[PDB]
Structure formats: C-alpha cells, structure tokens
C-alpha cells in the first residue's frame, strides 16, 4: 500500500506530482496537499499533488528533477505519504552548480533564483537540486542552508542568500542537462514502443530470470538522418542507467583487417562486464552492408563477425544492442532475422505537432518575442528533421545575438547573465534562419495525421457518412459485423469529374479517426513504372503496416495508363508492372492491421479493372460536380483567407457557375482576389474584394469539365448503377 510506479509527467514543475483520484482518496489527501516521496538510499523529496486525466491508478507522474533527487529511475516504485504539517520558511541559501554555470557572469540570483522563488511558494528540502532556464542557459542550483528543516515552502517574504563559490556536482546525483527523454520531441509513439521493450529487461532483470519469457535483444531504428535515432539511443541508456557504448561504421571501417573485428568484439565484451548495458551501432548499413553487394573480403568478414556477436547475446545477460540505419533494406538481411535485430521501429520524419515540440524543446532556454510563432514555422518546415529544426532555433538565436547583443557583449570569457536573459528572438530571426536552412529530408514522404476536417469540404454530406461507415464501423461495432457475417471492405475508389474534393475526403476521414495519412501521387507511380523499380511498391505498403492505423491513398490511378497513351497508346491491356505489385500487396494486407486503402481517378475507364474486384477497392463512390448549396459552401470556404465585401453575393455566383467544379470555383476566388490586388496596387501609382471583382472574374474563369465530359461522367456512373 501507498506504493506507486514512477513514470513521466506532463507537468514539468520541480515541486509537483500527479496522481489519479482513486489514490488521492486512498491516501486521504486533497488536490493541493503536500506529500513526501520516499525514494532510494534514504533520500526523500517534498511536492504538491495535483491530478489529470492521463495518470493511471498504479502510477505516480513526476519529472526528472524529482527522480534525480530521489535517486530513482523510470519504472521504479516509491512510497508516498501525506505531510499536512508543512509550513513556509524564513531564510534559504541556494547556490549554483559549477557544471551548469559556464559562459556567463553576474547576479545569478536576480536573473534566475528570484524569478524562480518569488511568489512561487515552492516546497523545497535541504540538498534538493532544481533547474532554472533562461538567458540561453540552463542553470541548476542546490539548496545548502535552511532555517526550518528538513523542508519548507519558500514564500515571497523569505530571505534568499546566494554567496559562495559554485558547487561541484556530487557523485550521487546526475546533471539535469544530461540527455534524457524530455529532450526528444516528435516520434513519441516510437519512443513509447522502445520503452516497453527496454525498460523491464534493464530496470527489473529479476522478472526475466524468474519468468519464462524471452527479452528483446536488439532494436533497429530507421529513417532519414537527423531525426533523433542517435538521440533516443543515448536518452534510453541515461534514463535506465545502463552502461552505454557507442559504435559507428566509419570508425570501425577506418581500422585495418583484424583491428576492426577486435574492436567490435571488445565493445560487446565491455557491455557484458558493465551489464546492464546498451550498445548502439550507428550507420548499420555502413558497418554491415549486404554481403551479396560487396566483393571485398574484409567487408564480408565484418558482417559475419557482427552476426556472431549478436547471436552471442544469448549468453551476455542484460545487454541490448540498438542500431540506426537510413533505410531498413540497405543492411544485410541476416541482421533482421529472428533474434539479432528482429525488432524495428520506424522513426521517419516528425509530423507538424512533433516539429513544433522540437522547436519548443530547443528554445526552452531562449527568450522569445511576442511575435514568434513556432507553430507556423513547424507547418512551413516541410522536409525538415529534428536536426534541421534545432539548427533553425540556433540560427534564429544567431540573428538575435548579432542584432542586439553584439553591441552589449565583450571579447572576454563570459557574458553578463542579466542582458542575456532579456535577449528575445524575433519572428524575422526565425524567418531568416528558415531561408538559410535546407531540409535534409525533402524527397522522403512525410506520413502524419492530416489536419483536414469535415468542415473543410463543401457538400458531399452522404459521402462523409459513408467513409465513417467504411473506416470506423468495422472496429467500433465488430459484434454486428460478426453477427450478420459481413466482410468489411478493404478500400474504396472514388471516380467522377475532377476538382470535387476527392483528396480532401480521404484526408478528412484519416483526421477524425486519428490515423496517419499516406499520399501516393502520380509521379511516384510513373517513376516506378518508367524505371522498372516496381519493387518499391512493397515499401509503400510496408509504411502503411508500420504507420497503422493509417489510410493508404493512391491518387491518379490512371497516371500510368495515360502515360501509355490513354485512349490510343499501345495494343496491350491495362495491366502493368506497378499495378501488379500494388494488387499483390493489397491481397497480402489484412484488415487486422487497421489499414484502409483509398483510390481516386478521374478516368476510371482506363484503369486495371482488377482493382475493383472483391478484396480490393470493391466499394465505388461517384463524386459529381457540387450542387447549388455545395458550390456556395465551397466559395465561402475558399474565401476564408481573404477579405470579402458585404456586397458580394456568393449564392448568385454559385447559381451561375452550374458547370464549375470546386477547383473551378477556386479559380474564380483566386481571380477575384488577384483583380482586387491589381486595382489596389494601381491606386498607389481596394481594402476588400468587391462584387465587381467577382463579376469580372466570371468573365475569365472557365469550367475544366466540358458538357461532353460531364455527360460521360454521369453515363459512366449510370452504367455502374
């Protein structure tokens, strides 16, 4: 009783933990009460209990600062007790730790400690270490003297001393700036999967000796460079306490035959001697490239040596080997066989939310101006990875320190802390950094939950409901499908005129379902066909399997048929190299992976009919041109980005644009906007888009689908009944 499992917290406050209500009732404490935490090696900490909707009953959520002072690690268990006799102090003495005060000088109390303690009412105990961020530094302090004991609340009316030399860090405590889990931004789902595999073998080895269950022995991380593969490996070892050893392909390859194998063996021997231990092998494809792809004897030998050492992990107790590669298929296939590196985690590229998190992490120490908008940056930084977002934060700080601080700074060892704390980075500083940086992963597909909602699609109310039944119902009501022997469809194909929102339909359902959206476009299907590299289709479906739950959207299914001449072309059939691989992968994909495949084409008469057979995209939805009320909704949605005059009659315009698609209604909106810009510019040689601008646009905009094509689309939909 009164024992809780230590886990991560969302509230980063140095004096707060979060409990689930059933434990607050068992301990007979209320929200805001002070408790004491009993850790390891006769160490304790004082904190305030709050609550949230994420903590489980058996867990206690705390940050790194509390775990460090308690000398506990994630996965351990501590005792908790109320202490209602807590009172405020009158005097405290807090001094910085030398390990974190570097490059700065001045009145550290006024810069850090006073903002930290003043009106903050924080519970502290003698000997506590806590971190205060600011001035582009992260400085931690120790409590060395208090009049009350052993703990008190620091009130705004207390006297805070800070006199004496900086204190050297003790061997019983770790630095709070050491790489941990709180330094990792995006790919939090991937980190959770790793923790599930790694925490128990290292934190609770007794479980795997006493219980007949096999541990993981290796994890392969893959994705573009700079995504956090090497950051995770270090953070895991530091959080769990395992001895960390670093291996990298180039360094091993820099050694002569016999030296490279000996050094690789020593790395494994050291991990066992210091077990529990984690070995990280970077550039796995460089140290162990596919043997069948190299004629060199030494390179084939080092692959055999690594495979032997990996198999030896059945004897080396409590040793886990992690590795990083750019592509999961660029390494010798033997490494990925059962055992060795049979478990893999897809790191990929951080999504818009993760990219913001990364920008926030690398600015925690930075002062940001009120005009700084890191969410807008995260949305614009397409193709960027964590290494690029960190570079953007540093480069933006370079402009802030050059523009303002360079006229304050000296050519000396340290800079005043007072002026650094007031150094705000502006929006123009991040914009400059964005123009100077170049995304390291712009060609690779970014897979994420889309931000398109149903409110972004004009009309199609019935199709929206149909997608919900196709994607959500099979898993929200599985007992009804079993009761009536219904086989859920594996996917749906959209057909009809262009410019009716087929792309948004697939994104909107992926968004509401909180599923990742994978977008395959014509150019990718054509590249595989033309280059005789249809094998890459397997990698596309493999992304869907790893990204699940997800929606796998194949756009422009006719892109190859049109590239083959479309209506005339050659004398052959609709089958080709790429569609054959796609159809094969579709048949090999089970609905149990929570992957739903959506197709779209504007020319269904020239696609391989096989894709419409049962087991494939056997659900067909016709998307006609928007009707009268839908066209109005489209015009209103498209104009949400511009000022529009009250005299603009969007219903009248929609009534005239009877043959226009949603894309053609956009052309009208864009033309009316450009006409408003033209007149506005001329007036200086206007504040809003007037009716005259839309009426003038009506004389330039045209429907993209001719009357002959509209009838063909309707007759095709009629033919399919």
């Amino acid at each position: 009783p009164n024992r809780l499992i230590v886990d991560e917290a969302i509230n980063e406050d140095n004096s707060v933990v979060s409990l689930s209500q059933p434990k607050m009732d068992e301990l007979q404490l209320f929200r805001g009460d002070t408790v004491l935490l009993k850790g390891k090696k006769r160490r304790e900490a004082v904190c305030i209990v709050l609550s949230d909707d994420t903590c489980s009953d058996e867990k206690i959520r705390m940050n790194r600062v509390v775990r460090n002072n308690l000398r506990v690690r994630l996965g351990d268990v501590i005792s908790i007790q109320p202490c209602p006799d807590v009172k405020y102090g009158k005097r405290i003495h807090v001094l910085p730790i030398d390990d974190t005060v570097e490059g700065i000088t001045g009145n550290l109390f006024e810069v850090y400690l006073k903002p930290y303690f003043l009106e903050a009412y924080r519970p502290i105990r003698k000997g506590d270490i806590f971190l205060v961020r600011g001035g582009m530094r992260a400085v931690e302090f120790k409590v060395v003297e208090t009049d009350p004991s052993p703990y008190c609340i620091v009130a705004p009316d207390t006297v805070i001393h800070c006199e004496g030399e900086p204190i050297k860090r003790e061997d019983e405590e770790e630095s709070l700036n050491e790489v941990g889990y709180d330094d990792i931004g995006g790919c939090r789902k991937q980190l959770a999967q790793i923790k599930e595999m790694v925490e128990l073998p290292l934190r609770h080895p007794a479980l795997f000796k006493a219980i007949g269950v096999k541990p993981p022995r290796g994890i392969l991380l893959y994705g573009p460079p700079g995504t956090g593969k090497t950051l995770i490996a270090r953070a895991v070892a530091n959080e769990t306490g395992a001895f960390f050893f670093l291996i990298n392909g180039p360094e091993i390859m820099s050694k002569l035959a016999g030296e490279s194998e000996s050094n690789l063996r020593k790395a494994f021997e050291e991990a066992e001697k210091n077990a529990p231990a984690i070995i990280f092998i970077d550039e796995l494809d460089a140290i162990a490239p596919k043997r069948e792809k190299t004629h060199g004897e030494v390179e084939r030998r080092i692959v055999s040596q690594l495979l032997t050492l990996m198999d030896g992990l059945k004897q080396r107790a409590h040793v886990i080997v992690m590795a990083a590669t750019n592509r999961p298929n660029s390494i010798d296939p033997a490494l990925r066989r059962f055992g060795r590196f049979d478990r893999e985690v897809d790191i990929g590229i951080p999504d818009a939310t993760g990219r913001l998190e990364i920008l926030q992490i690398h600015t925690k120490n930075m002062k940001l101006a009120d005009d700084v908008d890191l969410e807008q940056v995260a949305n614009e930084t397409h193709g960027h990875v964590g290494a690029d977002l960190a570079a953007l934060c540093s480069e933006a700080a370079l402009q802030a320190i050059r523009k303002k601080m360079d006229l304050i700074d000296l050519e000396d060892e340290t800079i005043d802390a007072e002026v650094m704390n007031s150094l705000a980075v502006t929006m123009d500083d991040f914009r400059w950094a964005l123009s100077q940086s170049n995304p390291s992963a712009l060609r690779e597909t970014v897979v994420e939950v889309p931000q398109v909602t149903w409110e972004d699609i004009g009309g199609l109310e019935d199709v929206k409901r149909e997608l919900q039944e196709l994607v959500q119902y099979p898993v929200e009501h599985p007992d009804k499908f079993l009761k009536f022997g219904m086989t859920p469809s594996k996917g749906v194909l959209f057909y009809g005129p262009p410019g009716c929102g087929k792309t948004l339909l697939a994104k909107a359902i992926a968004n509401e379902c909180q599923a990742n959206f994978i977008s395959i476009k014509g150019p990718e299907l054509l590249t595989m066909w033309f280059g005789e590299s249809e094998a890459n289709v397997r990698e596309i479906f493999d992304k869907a399997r790893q990204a699940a739950p997800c929606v796998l959207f194949f756009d422009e299914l006719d892109s190859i048929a049109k590239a083959r001449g479309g209506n005339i072309g050659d004398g052959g059939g609709a089958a080709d190299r790429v569609i054959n691989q796609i159809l094969t992968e579709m048949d090999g994909m089970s609905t149990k992976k929570n992957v739903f495949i959506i197709g779209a084409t504007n020319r269904p008469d020239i696609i391989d009919p096989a894709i419409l057979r049962p087991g494939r995209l056997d659900q067909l939805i016709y998307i006609p041109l928007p009707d009268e009320k839908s066209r109005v909704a489209i015009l209103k949605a498209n104009l949400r980005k511009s000022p529009v005059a009250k005299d603009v009659d969007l219903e009248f315009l929609a009534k005239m644009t009877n043959g226009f698609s949603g894309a053609d209604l956009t052309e009208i909106c864009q033309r009316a906007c450009k006409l408003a810009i033209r007149e506005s510019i001329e007036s200086e040689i206007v504040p809003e888009i007037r009716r005259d601008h839309f009426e003038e646009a009506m004389r330039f905009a045209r429907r993209s689908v001719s009357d002959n094509d509209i009838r063909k689309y309707e007759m095709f939909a009629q033919t399919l009944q």
Partner: peptide, 20 residues
C-alpha cells in the same frame, strides 16, 4: 492545510499560464 494550498495555488497559476 493553508500553507500547502498556498503552494498549490502558485503551482496551478504556473501550469494554467503555460497551458493558455
């Protein structure tokens, strides 16, 4: 007690200021 709720009020203010 009251000194504990005073610490809680300050912790809640810091948390809500960051969330908003």
């Amino acid at each position: 007690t009251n000194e504990a709720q005073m610490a809680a009020a300050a912790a809640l203010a810091r948390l809500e200021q960051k969330q908003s």
